Every structure is written in structure tokens, then in C-alpha cells.
Amino acid sequence: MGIRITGTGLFHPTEIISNEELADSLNAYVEQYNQENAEKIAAGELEELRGSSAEFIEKASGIKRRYVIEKSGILDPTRLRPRLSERSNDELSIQAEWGVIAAKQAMENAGVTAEDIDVVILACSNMQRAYPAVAIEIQSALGIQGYAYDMNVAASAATFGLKQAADAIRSGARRVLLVNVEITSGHLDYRNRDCHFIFGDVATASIIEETTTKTGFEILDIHLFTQFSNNIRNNFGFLNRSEDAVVDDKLFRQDGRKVFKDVAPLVAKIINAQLEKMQLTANDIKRFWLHQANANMNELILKYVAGKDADLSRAPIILDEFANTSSAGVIIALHRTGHEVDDGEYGVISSFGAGYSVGSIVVQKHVA
Amino acid sequence: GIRITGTGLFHPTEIISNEELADSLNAYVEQYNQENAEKIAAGELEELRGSSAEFIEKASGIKRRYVIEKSGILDPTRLRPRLSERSNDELSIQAEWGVIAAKQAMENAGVTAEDIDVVILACSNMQRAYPAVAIEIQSALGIQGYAYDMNVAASAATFGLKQAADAIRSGARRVLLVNVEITSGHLDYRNRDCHFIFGDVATASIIEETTTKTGFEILDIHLFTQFSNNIRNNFGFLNRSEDAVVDDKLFRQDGRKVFKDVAPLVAKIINAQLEKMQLTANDIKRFWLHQANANMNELILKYVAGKDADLSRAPIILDEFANTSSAGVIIALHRTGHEVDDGEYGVISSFGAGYSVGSIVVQKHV
Numbered sequence: 001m002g003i004r005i006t007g008t009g010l011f012h013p014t015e016i017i018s019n020e021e022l023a024d025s026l027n028a029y030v031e032q033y034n035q036e037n038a039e040k041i042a043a044g045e046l047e048e049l050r051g052s053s054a055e056f057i058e059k060a061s062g063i064k065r066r067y068v069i070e071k072s073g074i075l076d077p078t079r080l081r082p083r084l085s086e087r088s089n090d091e092l093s094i095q096a097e098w099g100v101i102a103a104k105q106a107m108e109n110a111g112v113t114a115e116d117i118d119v120v121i122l123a124c125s126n127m128q129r130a131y132p133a134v135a136i137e138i139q140s141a142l143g144i145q146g147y148a149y150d151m152n153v154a155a156s157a158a159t160f161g162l163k164q165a166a167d168a169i170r171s172g173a174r175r176v177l178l179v180n181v182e183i184t185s186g187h188l189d190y191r192n193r194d195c196h197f198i199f200g201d202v203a204t205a206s207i208i209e210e211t212t213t214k215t216g217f218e219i220l221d222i223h224l225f226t227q228f229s230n231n232i233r234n235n236f237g238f239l240n241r242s243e244d245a246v247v248d249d250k251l252f253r254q255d256g257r258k259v260f261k262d263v264a265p266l267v268a269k270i271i272n273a274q275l276e277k278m279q280l281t282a283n284d285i286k287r288f289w290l291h292q293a294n295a296n297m298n299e300l301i302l303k304y305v306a307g308k309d310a311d312l313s314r315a316p317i318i319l320d321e322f323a324n325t326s327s328a329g330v331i332i333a334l335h336r337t338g339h340e341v342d343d344g345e346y347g348v349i350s351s352f353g354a355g356y357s358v359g360s361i362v363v364q365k366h367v368a
Numbered sequence: 369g370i371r372i373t374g375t376g377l378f379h380p381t382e383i384i385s386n387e388e389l390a391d392s393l394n395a396y397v398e399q400y401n402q403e404n405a406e407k408i409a410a411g412e413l414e415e416l417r418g419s420s421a422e423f424i425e426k427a428s429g430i431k432r433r434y435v436i437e438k439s440g441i442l443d444p445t446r447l448r449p450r451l452s453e454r455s456n457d458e459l460s461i462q463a464e465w466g467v468i469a470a471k472q473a474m475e476n477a478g479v480t481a482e483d484i485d486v487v488i489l490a491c492s493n494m495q496r497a498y499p500a501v502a503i504e505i506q507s508a509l510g511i512q513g514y515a516y517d518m519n520v521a522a523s524a525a526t527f528g529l530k531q532a533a534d535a536i537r538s539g540a541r542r543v544l545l546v547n548v549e550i551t552s553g554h555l556d557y558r559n560r561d562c563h564f565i566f567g568d569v570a571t572a573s574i575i576e577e578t579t580t581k582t583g584f585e586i587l588d589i590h591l592f593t594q595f596s597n598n599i600r601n602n603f604g605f606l607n608r609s610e611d612a613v614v615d616d617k618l619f620r621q622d623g624r625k626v627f628k629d630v631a632p633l634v635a636k637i638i639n640a641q642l643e644k645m646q647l648t649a650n651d652i653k654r655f656w657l658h659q660a661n662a663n664m665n666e667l668i669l670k671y672v673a674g675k676d677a678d679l680s681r682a683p684i685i686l687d688e689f690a691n692t693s694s695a696g697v698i699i700a701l702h703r704t705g706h707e708v709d710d711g712e713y714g715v716i717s718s719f720g721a722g723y724s725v726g727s728i729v730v731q732k733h734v
């Protein structure tokens with residue numbers, strides 16, 4: 001009671017990569033690969049590589065384009081990763097820089113300042129370093145006093161973070177700043193036509209406070225769920241060096257088929273049980289802010305929740321423009337469309353993805 | 369009514385002593401200074417200095433430490449454990465250690481997988497980004513509910529306890545909190561300044577809503593962070609895209625700056641916390657402090673509890689384990705918690721990288 005999301009903030013890099021640009025880049029690296037290894041392809045010693053097309057990506061997912069930290073390196077067939085430069089310890093890290101920009105916007109939108117925040121949580125799928133925590137770096141650049149920590153549960157990091165924010169407020173925090181910084185172009189495999197299009201880069205932020213006097217989305221119910229799966233996995237980590245690792249699995253890897261069939265009914269079951277628990281029907285939900293990876297999966301989830309007459313008219317899509325931004329996607333959607341909910345109406349925020357993790361949150365808008 | 373009701377501890381088998389560690393580093397430096405005698409006389413590469421086991425012990429109180437794999441750390445040509453990649457079908461090393469510790473803590477609390485709602489992995493370094501290894505631990509124990517990874521380096525256990533407590537206040541019955549610290553994967557064994565500081569370990573804790581189980585009731589928590597670059601490791605998933613070359617992808621610290629900054633800070637936090645609780649230092653039977661440096665702990669004790677305070681009020685396990693980062697306070701509480709009788713007070717207090725400090729006032733119940 002009285003715990004509300006009172007502000008959100010969005011930052012994305014300026015450069016954009018269209019599906020067509022992405023497919024042309026992959027197709028060049030494929031052509032080049034199949035040439036240099038024409039021999040061992042004929043002997044079966046090496047796998048022939050397949051390409052893709054803008055049309056396949058868009059029908060596969062709904063994605064048309066994405067923002068990226070740096071465009072030329074990702075598209076260069078001889079690199080296929082952003083062109084970045086080490087910063088010194090004296091300057092803001094990349095992850096902390098993006099986080100600060102999104103955070104400042106959430107704070108202005110909530111009408112709060114640095115002295116009003118007690119907790120900073122950096123919740124996302126990959127931290128730029130292990131220590132000092134990037135959340136502490138964000139906290140300091142913003143001049144916030146209190147404490148901060150980094151939290152990783154990949155696709156549901158934002159809903160899990162909202163829960164942790166609610167718990168900390170319930171026990172005494174005044175206001176929590178929750179930050180999601182996803183530089184997915186840093187761990188994506190741009191050589192793989194099945195995953196190279198899925199992800200884009202972004203940072204989002206949220207202000208969560210105890211209040212009855214500020215406009216926001218009041219949290220009514222949270223359900224969090226994990227169930228270990230290896231269908232999404234990235235084995236990059238600090239022990240690779242000691243393992244003298246050689247397996248080529250240190251980037252995002254996935255069995256998209258299995259993920260689709262496992263997670264869609266799982267998410268739907270969680271949402272339906274949550275709605276029944278709250279004595280609401282699908283028809284009482286003004287907006288579903290679902291994970292933003294695959295428009296076809298979301299459409300199927302609403303069929304399981306709101307009948308086979310279902311439909312995305314109340315389930316906004318931002319993945320056409322952002323692609324999949326992992327933990328940040330639900331927050332992007334809420335940022336862009338929360339204004340379409342009226343005073344007193346209900347919405348549902350639901351993350352789902354790697355780990356298998358699922359976070360589902362029932363909110364109600366209040367206007368002060 | 370929320371209590372820490374069990375703790376568990378796993379350490380690997382092999383022991384490395386100050387002597388072996390100094391000989392191994394001394395052999396590297398003699399060998400490095402041998403191949404580069406030119407550029408050290410021609411002022412291009414610096415002439416490496418060695419270390420002494422006598423220095424290590426008096427600087428910190430550390431004598432030995434457990435390690436995941438001994439031979440590769442001591443090998444002056446490698447200076448890092450010899451591990452092998454496991455396939456996804458196998459339990460990861462970090463999950464394996466956390467499971468072993470978790471079962472012991474579950475046993476000591478009289479609890480089964482059924483009884484647990486949340487699993488938190490809270491340590492200084494995660495083996496991988498996704499799927500969370502806390503989820504891997506959760507599934508290996510058969511626990512149902514949710515799990516997540518959380519990193520605040522040295523204070524990850526006190527921060528995790530706060531998070532466990534807050535989750536119970538919101539509806540969780542029981543939380544399993546795990547701290548797995550394979551520091552040999554990110555310690556710099558070439559660096560005389562820090563190669564002796566860290567050991568490997570895993571700890572676990574059960575936190576429950578209860579008034580009828582023996583354990584430590586959590587009474588007050590003060591968490592604090594303040595960005596400092598005085599402890600930093602720049603390894604990360606963007607190094608590949610930065611085409612990184614700076615030799616800072618391992619543990620680095622300015623230990624004496626850390627000492628001056630953090631020691632008075634910890635004592636100010638504890639004193640204010642005691643005042644808030646309307647306790648005095650005399651009311652605290654055991655201070656479970658971060659297990660990094662015995663001199664630092666000695667100074668913090670004699671500042672909060674006065675000169676003449678018995679040093680047995682601040683138990684030390686860093687002599688056997690070296691610095692274990694987030695797990696240090698949990699080891700100490702595990703090994704000397706029985707030393708606190710019913711109705712007596714304790715203080716758990718971790719501190720370190722990030723500058724993080726976390727401090728918890730507890731009371732024993734039997």
C-alpha cells in the first residue's frame with residue numbers, strides 16, 4: 001500500500017541499425033567465411049554458414065531496427081562488435097554514464113533530487129565489472145547518499161528490482177532509484193543468423209517511493225519465479241582464464257524454439273493466477289507491459305490470458321524500434337505508454353527470459 | 369521476529385602457506401628480472417620486487433589460505449589455478465561450492481528444500497552473467513520460488529541478509545543466502561602488494577521468520593556505500609569490444625588508503641548503530657568483523673569498545689582462511705556463534721570494495 005512508481009527515464013544511443021543493414025553485414029561475413037573455407041566445407045570438416053534477410057527478422061520477431069552504442073564496428077564484417085575504447089578510472093564508465101542519464105530523467109519526472117533517494121539498484125543482465133559496483137558509481141555521480149548494489153537476473157532484472165525496491169521501502173527506505181543498463185551489443189554473437197538481430201542497447205530508470213500524494217503506478221501484487229534452464233546461456237566469466245577456455249560459447253547463445261514453447265504457457269499461467277488472486281479479469285487490465293523480445297510470443301501469451309479472440313491492442317510494442325533490451329524492455333514500454341492508463345485503471349508488468357526467470361506485477365494508476 | 373537459524377561452510381582441500389606463496393612469487397620475479405635485466409638497466413620496464421612471509425603475517429595476521437587448485441597458483445610460469453571448462457550439463461564450480469555449503473546450513477537449521485522460498489547468491493564475483501548461478505543452485509537443491517545474483521563485493525553478505533530480512537517481512541517464510549568466493553580466479557599472483565590477501569571459500573545462511581528456533585535475531589541494519597577507486601578490477605564483458613590492453617583486469621588496491629578511509633568509517637557506523645539501539649559496546653559479546661586485516665579489526669575494536677577490550681570479543685578466522693571477501697563475517701559467525709549465550713548481543717560488520725559497509729546488530733535466542 002502506498003508504494004508507487006512515480007517516474008521513469010529512458011536513454012538510448014543515437015546510432016541506429018536497420019534489419020536490412022544488419023542482414024547485409026551478416027551476409028557479407030557469411031559469403032567471406034564460406035569462401036575462405038570452401039575446402040573444409042566440401043570435406044565436411046567445417047559447417048557452411050547460412051545468412052538472413054530483413055524480411056525474415058521482421059516476420060520472426062517484429063523487430064525493424066535497434067539502437068547501438070557504436071555502429072561501424074558491429075556492421076564491419078571483419079569485426080562484428082562495437083568499436084569501444086578503455087576509459088580511465090577517473091572518468092565515468094560507459095555503463096554508469098548511461099545509467100546516470102536515464103536516472104536524471106526519472107528523477108526530474110518524479111520531481112525528486114539526489115537528497116531524496118535512499119537506495120540505488122543497478123538491475124540488468126550484464127555488469128561492466130565486478131567491483132567497485134557500477135551501482136555505487138552511478139550513486140556517486142548523482143551525489144546520492146545511502147547504499148547501492150548490482151543485481152543480475154537477466155530478463156527479469158527490472159521486475160525483481162521493483163520487488164526489492166518495494167521491500168526496502170516497506171522496511172524503511174523513502175525512495176529507491178532502480179536502473180537498468182543493457183549494452184547487449186557487447187555480448188551478442190553477430191555471426192549467428194538466429195540471434196544476431198534479437199537485441200538492442202538502452203538504459204532505463206525508475207523512481208519508487210512511498211507516497212499517497214504523487215501521480216504514479218501503485219504496486220498491488222508481485223510474483224517472481226525462477227526455474228533453471230540452459231536454453232539461454234553465456235559462459236563468459238572471470239574463471240575463463242584459469243580454465244584456459246576454448247569453447248566458442250562466451251557470447252549469447254539460445255535455443256529459441258524451446259524458449260518459446262517453455263515460457264509462453266509459463267508466463268500466461270503466472271499472470272492468470274495473479275489476476276484470479278487479485279479478483280480481476282483480463283478485461284480489467286488496461287495495459288499489459290510485457291517483455292519486449294518477440295511480438296509473436298506476446299500475442300500468444302495474451303491468447304492464453306484473454307482468450308483466443310486476443311490481440312495486441314492493449315499490449316504495446318516497443319521492440320519494433322528498440323529490438324530486445326532484456327531487463328529494460330518492460331520499463332521502456334511503461335515509459336512510452338503509461339499515459340494511456342486512466343486514473344484508477346489497472347496494468348500488468350511482466351518480464352520473462354533467461355534463467356528462466358519471470359516477474360509479474362499488478363499495478364493501478366493514481367493521479368494526484 | 370526474523371532470525372539467522374543456520375550457517376554452513378565449505379572450503380577446498382589444498383592449503384597454501386605464506387612461505388610457499390612468497391617462494392612462488394619470489395621465483396617469478398627473479399625469473400622476470402632475469403629476462404629483462406636490459407630494460408630494467410635501460411629504464412623501460414620496472415624491476416619487480418619480491419615479498420616475504422614475515423611481512424605478510426605481521427601486515428595482516430594471515431598465515432595460510434585454502435585454494436581451489438594449488439599447483440597452478442604456485443607454478444611461477446602460470447600463477448593461476450589449473451581448472452577445466454565444464455559442460456552445461458554439469459554443475460558449475462560456483463554452484464557446486466554453494467550447494468555444499470547450502471546443504472550444511474540447511475541441515476543445521478533443520479530445514480528442507482520445501483521450506484525455502486528465496487535463494488540469493490551474494491558475493492564479489494559471479495562465474496557467468498546468465499543463467500544466474502543462484503538459479504542453478506536453487507534447482508540443484510530442488511528449491512521452489514525465485515533466485516537472483518547480487519554483487520556488493522566485501523559487504524555482499526550483510527547486504528544479502530538485509531535483502532533476506534526484507535523479503536521475509538514481505539511474505540517469504542525462509543531465505544537461503546549463499547556466498548561463494550573463488551578469489552584465486554581474480555587475484556593477481558604477480559603482485560607483491562596483494563597476492564597474499566585472499567583465499568577461497570563458500571558460506572551459506574538460513575534466515576527465517578520465527579520466535580521458536582535457536583538463532584540470531586536481526587535487530588538493526590545499517591548499509592552504506594560511497595564510490596572509491598581504491599579497490600578495483602576492470603575485467604568485464606566489454607573488454608573484448610574495447611580491445612583492452614591495460615593490465616588491470618585483476619584485483620588492484622591501494623591498501624593503505626583503504627585502511628585510513630574505512631577503519632574510522634566502520635567504527636562511526638557501529639557506534640551510531642549502538643547508540644540508536646540504546647546499547648553500549650560493553651553489551652556486545654562478539655563483534656564479527658570483516659576478515660581482511662587483523663590490525664584493522666584490532667583498531668576498530670579498541671575504538672568502539674575501548675582499550676583493554678578483550679581481543680576475543682573480535683574473533684579472527686583470517687589466519688586460516690586469509691581474506692574471503694563477502695564470506696568472511698559468515699565464517700567467523702559460523703565458527704564462534706556458539707560463544708554467544710541466550711540473550712546476548714552481537715554485531716556483524718563487513719566492509720571493503722566499492723567502499724561498502726554493512727553492519728547488523730543481532731541477539732542470540734536458544
Ligand SMILES: CCCCCCCC(=O)SCCNC(=O)CCNC(=O)[C@H](O)C(C)(C)COP(=O)(O)OP(=O)(O)OC[C@H]1O[C@@H](n2cnc3c(N)ncnc32)[C@H](O)[C@@H]1OP(=O)(O)O
Pocket residue numbers: 131418419420423424427428492521522551554555560561562565566599619621623624626627660661664691693694719720721
Ligand atoms: C579477490 C577480491 C574480492 C573482492 C573483495 C574486495 C573487497 C575487500 O574484501 S577489501 C580487502 C582489502 N584490504 C582491506 O580491507 C584493509 C586495507 N588495508 C590492508 O589490507 C593492508 O594495508 C595490507 C595487508 C594490504 C598491507 O598493510 P601495510 O603494512 O599497511 O602495507 P604498506 O603500508 O602498503 O607497505 C609499506 C612497506 O611495505 C612494502 N610491501 C608491500 N607489500 C610487501 C610485500 N608483499 N612484501 C614485503 N614488503 C611489502 C611496501 O612496498 C613498503 O615498503 P617500504 O616502505 O619499506 O619502502
